[PDB]
Design a protein around this nucleic acid. Structure first.
Ligand SMILES: [Mg+2]
Ligand SMILES: [Mg+2]
Ligand SMILES: [Mg+2]
Ligand SMILES: [Mg+2]
Ligand SMILES: [Mg+2]
Ligand SMILES: [Mg+2]
Ligand SMILES: [Mg+2]
Ligand SMILES: [Mg+2]
Ligand SMILES: [Mg+2]
Ligand SMILES: [Mg+2]
Ligand SMILES: [Zn+2]
Lengths: 25, 71, 221, 132, 129, 83, 101, 217
RNA sequence: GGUUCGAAGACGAUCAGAUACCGUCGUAGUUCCGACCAUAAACGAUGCCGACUGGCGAUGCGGCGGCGUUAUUCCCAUGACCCGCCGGGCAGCUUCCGGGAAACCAAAGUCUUUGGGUUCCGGGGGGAGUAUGGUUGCAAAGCUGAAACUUAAAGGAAUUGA
């Protein structure tokens, strides 16, 4: 699991987290 | 030491404080996060009531049931 | 049994014509035969095996295991040797390491701490030896201190005649190979260090190869 | 694959230096010479030694062989080395000399020798190889 | 930029003594350098030297012997009392028989053994042996 | 090296290079000690007198061993001053 | 492990060198890193030279050359055997192979 | 020389030097030899100061004479230009010659058959004889070498500036090095020319040998 | 404004599958103007300023000196070669300077013989450049940045095998 793709996965997951957060705020 | 002036004691001293927080053993003794995570609260011993008797497996190279108690 | 010298320096020693190996140290001659040493120090030389270290190489079928022995020798006043020999069997490694230890014996300068009363006991000054990552420092110490050091550089010092010394070791000292011969490096350069009591201009002595040329021509060619 | 091993070549090279005079040029006679002069424990390497000895003869006849020294050939090596001419190659009535060393000799007490001839130095300092 | 001329002078002497030369050229000159070598002179560690006088900070050419092991400078110039002097010489001298700490006092630039002999503290400059 | 009473307690006095004045070690196997013969003034033949020079292995490996010999020779008159 | 002192290229004081295109594939390679062949050959190669020479209408016609310059990425250069790997100390010499034939 | 008129170089020696081209060096000059050189031509060749060649030659002779046993002075020449001169130098002076390939270990491997430990090496060229000079670093013995304008002076103790690549110059330098050791040891007097002809020391390549053989016969 | 190339997409191949490598077509983009973004193996994986410590042959700029060739021609002088010297610069070869765990480095040397000035920055491996808070941005994201918990190793240079 090369770090470039791991970082890309992390960014997508973080974007989903953020969206789900202002959906609730 | 890198800076070697006569009037650089504030520089040298305030650089120790910052870099001591990257010491793992210093980090946990001087923060309250480690003390509040301790079940004992910082004591050497503690008393409790037995809830149940349980046995755990050991680990990969070993093979034995470790007799434990949930307290 | 009887020793037949093949070196020029060996013939002179056996003919009882060099007064001491202290004379041949003065001219930095290469002692290439093991029998000059025990001729001069044979009764007073004690040997001690530092350890046995089984290195091994991996071949097509299994591993080839050879045992390596560190041996330290020296009379208990002024001489220390350290030899290393690797061989397929432990007994031969020890015998071959003592032979290598005898050829490498170097004399030890020992001086005074504070005032100069009695026999010299300490290192003359602060000396440092290095090999690999090991840095070893010997600091002069007062009389009766004893040797304060790790166990393995301590036994080298007790067979040097140095009876008190402060030490300090840096690096991976658990590597006994480097850590043994980093102490022996610091011991070696205790004559290489020029002290204000060595400022007298040297009066040259005429060399044994030149002094004893006539017996040399006759006895063997 | 008829390559002669060391135990044949070494034996032949020893025989040739110690018995050069007795050996010949044919295989059959010096095969008998080798048989009687050395104890060779079987016929096959006796023939292979004798065969190599015969082969070495022709090389020796044409000229020297590096690994082996027969008595005759160096006797004329030292005769060649001892040779000396009648007039010296270092004795000339004209020694060709360029200007600059004449000043180098002038600084020496040898300001003017008897038989020094000065030449004109080469004009154009083109003494390097072209870079490429 | 150049900050401590005495630090450059002693580093230059130490490199040329370490490589076995016979003379060293010290590019900047000052009273502190000239007074420091005269202390090393009196104890036989260096030979006699010579300062060249251009109308700027002069140069110095110093004759070397084979007796110098190391000359050095301590930065910054700490102040040292008579109580601290035994600890300083315990740190940066090889043995108790030879080696010197040069330290300036109100009595002048002068080494440690006799600075104790007239009971004056001072500021540490360097050491040699 | 003397003690308080004045006895020589040093085990031996090591040699010392004639060009750089550093000590020649007991295992310095690159060091040399070269003897230079002496001639008499009128005939120029070997008397039996030497001039002895010691060179440490550092100088020889540095490539300055001959220049040191060259100057030490004219320091004792073996080589002409003009050179 | 630092395999080569210069990092396989010839960039010393630039910071950026423009890229070129490989000839075998279209791999984009910096100009200084690429392996450059400069082949100079006749149009007719070796066996037809007699055939055109006798069929030519001119007398003593000098046949033209064909000057084309090649560029190679490291991958194509190895795979086409224009360059091959060498022993560690043999990597250091940088004189081209002999040019007699 | 010591500025002694008996040891001063004379006219009949200088012409021999000039004929052999000993003064002529090369196109290169390393910093160690720059004070043995007079100056540079417009041809690109350096001129070797013959005054310093002679004095350094005499200094080398002093060191050889100091060795009382002539047998433990070793002489080496690997290149074929100086092999004959080495065979002749040992004949006149009594030294032990090593001509041809120097097998590594003669000075350090006592178990070898040809284990010899002399007290002095005289070498024809430091570059072509790098191996014996390196061996001299392991046992305490000085080294003497003929050095051109480019040869490095690693491990060399008496560098004699000359033209150590010309066929004549190598022979001439070995010839009068043998002459001065004999004159200083008293075997020969300085009043007469030495009967040994210098041409006896020149290397003679195979090509010119048959040419004179058919000429002589 | 849009020639070529070409994320996405479409189809044809191959394949056990092939949302790929190969092929054809092709959108955003690739070009320019005016505004944002502030990250790259943004690398010499190597802070800046200053001093000292070996050679050798080159190369670029400027300057100085010198045989001689070659133009202008009509000789002076400027150009083009050639031979050196000086100062900055990009590098190179060699070295028992010295250092380094070594690979290697004329600096990555002048360090237990430890102090020229000064800035930034690391403290076993993960969790994790993550959670939260703050701040910047149109957005994408940037900067600052933990802990609980987990684990005796993770790792660097070199050696012999496979
Ligand atoms: Mg790799
Ligand atoms: Mg870039
Ligand atoms: Mg498809
Ligand atoms: Mg297309
Ligand atoms: Mg970054
Ligand atoms: Mg970085
Ligand atoms: Mg430090
Ligand atoms: Mg950590
Ligand atoms: Mg475990
Ligand atoms: Mg890594
Ligand atoms: Zn390609």
């Amino acid at each position: 699991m090369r770090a470039k793709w791991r970082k890309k996965r992390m960014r997508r997951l973080k974007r989903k987290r953020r969206k789900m957060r202002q959906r609730s705020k | 030491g890198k800076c070697r002036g006569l009037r650089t004691a504030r520089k040298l001293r305030s650089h120790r404080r910052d870099q001591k927080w990257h010491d793992k053993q210093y980090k946990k003794a001087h923060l309250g996060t480690a003390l509040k995570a301790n079940p004992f609260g910082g004591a050497s011993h503690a008393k409790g009531i037995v809830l149940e008797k349980v046995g755990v497996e050991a680990k990969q190279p070993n093979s034995a049931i470790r007799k434990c108690v949930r307290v | 049994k009887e020793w037949l010298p093949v070196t020029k320096l060996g013939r002179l020693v056996k003919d009882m014509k060099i007064k001491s190996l202290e004379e041949i140290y003065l001219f930095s001659l290469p002692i290439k035969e093991s029998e000059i040493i025990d001729f001069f120090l044979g009764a007073s030389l004690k040997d001690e095996v530092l350890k046995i270290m089984p290195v091994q190489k991996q071949t097509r079928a299994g591993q080839r295991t050879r045992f390596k022995a560190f041996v330290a020798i020296g009379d208990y006043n002024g001489h220390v040797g350290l030899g290393v020999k690797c061989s397929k069997e432990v007994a031969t490694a020890i015998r071959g390491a003592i032979i290598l230890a005898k050829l490498s014996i170097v004399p030890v300068r020992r001086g005074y701490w504070g005032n100069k009363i009695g026999k010299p006991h300490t290192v003359p000054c602060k000396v440092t030896g290095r090999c690999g990552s090991v840095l070893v420092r010997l600091i002069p110490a007062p009389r009766g201190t004893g040797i304060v050091s790790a166990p393995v550089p301590k036994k080298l010092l007790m067979m040097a005649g140095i009876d008190d010394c402060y030490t300090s070791a840096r690096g991976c000292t658990a590597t006994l190979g480097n850590f043994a011969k980093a102490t022996f490096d610091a011991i070696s350069k205790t004559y290489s260090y020029l002290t204000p009591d060595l400022w007298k201009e040297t009066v040259f002595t005429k060399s044994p190869y030149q002094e004893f040329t006539d017996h040399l021509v006759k006895t063997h060619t | 694959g008829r390559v002669r091993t060391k135990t044949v070549k070494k034996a032949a090279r020893v025989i040739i230096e110690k018995y050069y005079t007795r050996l010949g040029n044919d295989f059959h006679t010096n095969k008998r010479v080798c048989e009687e002069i050395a104890i060779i424990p079987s016929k096959k390497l006796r023939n292979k030694i004798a065969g190599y000895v015969t082969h070495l003869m022709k090389r020796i006849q044409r000229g020297p062989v590096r690994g082996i020294s027969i008595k005759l050939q160096e006797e004329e090596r030292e005769r060649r080395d001892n040779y000396v001419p009648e007039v010296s190659a270092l004795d000339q009535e004209i020694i060709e000399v360029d200007p600059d060393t004449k000043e180098m000799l002038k600084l020496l007490d040898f300001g003017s020798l008897s038989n020094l001839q000065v030449t004109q130095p080469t004009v154009g300092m083109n003494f390097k190889t072209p870079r490429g | 930029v150049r900050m401590n001329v005495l630090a450059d002078a002693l580093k230059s002497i130490n490199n040329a003594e370490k490589r076995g030369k016979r003379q060293v050229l010290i590019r900047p000159c000052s009273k502190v350098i000239v007074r420091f070598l005269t202390v090393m002179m009196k104890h036989g560690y260096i030979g006699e030297f010579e300062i060249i006088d251009d109308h700027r900070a002069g140069k110095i050419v110093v004759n070397l012997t084979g007796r110098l092991n190391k000359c050095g400078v301590i930065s910054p110039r700490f102040d040292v009392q008579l109580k601290d002097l035994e600890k300083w010489q315990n740190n940066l001298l090889p043995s108790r028989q030879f080696g010197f700490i040069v330290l300036t006092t109100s009595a002048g630039i002068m080494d440690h053994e006799e600075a104790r002999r007239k009971h004056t503290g001072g500021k540490i400059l360097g050491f040699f042996f | 090296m003397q003690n308080d009473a004045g006895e020589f307690v040093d085990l031996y006095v090591p040699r010392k290079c004639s060009a750089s004045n550093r000590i020649i070690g007991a295992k310095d196997h690159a060091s040399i000690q070269m003897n230079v013969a002496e001639v008499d003034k009128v005939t120029g033949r070997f008397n039996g007198q030497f001039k002895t020079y010691a060179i440490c292995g550092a100088i020889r490996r540095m490539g300055e061993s001959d220049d040191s010999i060259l100057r030490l020779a004219k320091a004792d008159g073996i080589v002409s001053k003009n050179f | 492990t630092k395999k080569r002192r210069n990092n396989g290229r010839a960039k010393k004081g630039r910071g950026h060198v423009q890229p070129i295109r490989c000839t075998n594939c279209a791999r984009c390679v910096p100009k200084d890193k690429a392996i450059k062949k400069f082949v100079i050959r006749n149009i007719v190669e070796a066996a037809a030279v007699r055939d055109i020479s006798e069929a030519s209408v001119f007398d003593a016609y000098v046949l033209p050359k064909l000057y084309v310059k090649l560029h190679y990425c490291v991958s194509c250069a190895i795979h086409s055997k224009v360059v091959r790997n060498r022993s560690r100390e043999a990597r250091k010499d940088r004189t081209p192979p002999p040019r007699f034939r | 020389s010591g500025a002694l008129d008996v040891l001063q170089m004379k006219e009949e020696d200088v012409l021999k030097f000039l004929a052999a081209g000993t003064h002529l060096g090369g196109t290169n000059l390393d910093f160690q030899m720059e004070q043995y050189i007079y100056k540079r031509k417009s041809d690109g060749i350096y001129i070797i100061n013959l005054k310093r060649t002679w004095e350094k030659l005499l200094l080398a002779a002093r060191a050889i004479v100091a060795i009382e046993n002539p047998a433990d002075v070793s002489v080496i020449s690997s290149r074929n230009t100086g092999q004959r001169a080495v065979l002749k130098f040992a004949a006149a002076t009594g030294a032990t010659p090593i001509a041809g390939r120097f097998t590594p270990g003669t000075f350090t491997n006592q178990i070898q058959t040809a284990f010899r430990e002399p007290r002095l090496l005289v070498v024809t060229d430091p570059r072509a004889d790098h191996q014996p000079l390196t061996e001299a670093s392991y046992v305490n013995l000085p080294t003497i070498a003929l050095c051109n304008t480019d040869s490095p002076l690693r491990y060399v103790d008496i560098a004699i500036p000359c033209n150590n690549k010309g066929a004549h110059s190598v022979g001439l330098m070995w010839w009068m090095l043998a002459r001065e050791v004999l004159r200083m040891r008293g075997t020969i007097s300085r009043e007469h020319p030495w009967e040994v002809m210098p041409d006896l020391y020149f290397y003679r390549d195979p090509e010119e040998i048959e040419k004179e053989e058919q000429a002589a016969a």
